[PDB]
Amino acid sequence: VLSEGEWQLVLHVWAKVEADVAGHGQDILIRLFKSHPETLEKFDRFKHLKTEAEMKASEDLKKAGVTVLTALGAILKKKGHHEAELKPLAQSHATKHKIPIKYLEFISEAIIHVLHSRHPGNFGADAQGAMNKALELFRKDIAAKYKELGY
Ligand code: HEM
């Protein structure tokens, strides 16, 4: 459970992302792919991309970044009341895309990495704490649906 002050922090951080959704989302996916190459293999849509330059130049990767962050942004703004929004993502990711929960931990770390990279001196220690908590809560709640389905 996050406090109100912690959710306020999360959403102030998210306001930074909303100023350049496609940029943050592309950066997040690139970091994920480069740090954890097994993640890229799950995307028939992107597995042609070999080099970071190709990833950076991929307009479709930007579009995927918008899609991901649009969904995560809406989720965060529910401030934990996100059962309706998580259900379809659990189903798709566990059963169709075959994404292990470990890879959600990896994308969570990518988010923190990219926020630090883009906002040096402006991503506060309190904010990092709160954002970690929010992402932990998301993973816990998705993980429960995975467990249900045998994943
Ligand atoms: C914050 C975490 C995540 C969010 C909010 C998210 C959100 C989404 C959304 C909204 C879609 C499109 C709708 C759907 O199929 O359900 C999608 C598709 C997909 N996601 Fe995720 N995702 C996340 C993490 C991951 C991770 C970590 C991976 C892989 C390592 C992954 C792999 C995929 C794949 C393969 C697709 C289908 C892409 C396509 O072929 O168009 N997702 N995701």
Side-chain angles (χ1 to χ4, degrees):
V1 174
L2 282 70
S3 71
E4 290 284 349
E6 284 168 338
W7 281 120
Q8 188 182 41
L9 285 166
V10 170
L11 299 181
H12 288 157
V13 178
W14 201 252
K16 294 184 203 297
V17 175
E18 288 188 335
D20 182 8
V21 175
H24 282 88
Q26 197 189 32
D27 289 349
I28 290 162
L29 293 170
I30 293 167
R31 178 73 184 181
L32 180 65
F33 295 158
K34 293 320 285 190
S35 309
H36 308 282
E38 65 270 37
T39 57
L40 179 58
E41 280 276 273
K42 295 288 181 175
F43 287 89
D44 288 333
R45 184 172 165 193
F46 296 125
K47 69 186 180 177
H48 70 295
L49 293 163
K50 307 212 170 119
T51 68
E52 188 172 335
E54 291 174 330
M55 298 176 176
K56 197 78 157 86
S58 171
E59 301 297 325
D60 195 55
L61 193 53
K62 286 163 59 177
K63 179 191 183 183
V66 172
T67 299
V68 177
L69 296 189
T70 298
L72 181 60
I75 288 162
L76 292 179
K77 296 174 178 177
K78 298 308 298 298
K79 303 167 61 194
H81 294 99
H82 49 216
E83 301 81 17
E85 295 75 8
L86 295 191
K87 191 173 195 187
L89 296 174
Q91 170 140 47
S92 67
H93 288 62
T95 79
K96 179 173 147 80
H97 308 317
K98 312 302 212 130
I99 305 309
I101 294 304
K102 186 75 189 181
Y103 298 9
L104 307 176
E105 185 179 355
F106 297 159
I107 202 173
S108 300
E109 294 185 330
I111 288 163
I112 299 294
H113 183 81
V114 168
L115 290 166
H116 267 113
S117 186
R118 290 173 70 112
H119 308 281
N122 288 118
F123 179 33
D126 62 356
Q128 185 183 334
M131 183 57 66
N132 272 7
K133 286 176 68 170
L135 296 168
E136 288 154 4
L137 177 63
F138 170 85
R139 290 209 304 284
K140 175 183 146 115
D141 287 348
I142 283 249
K145 317 244 206 199
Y146 274 57
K147 184 180 175 290
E148 179 189 310
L149 301 167
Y151 285 90

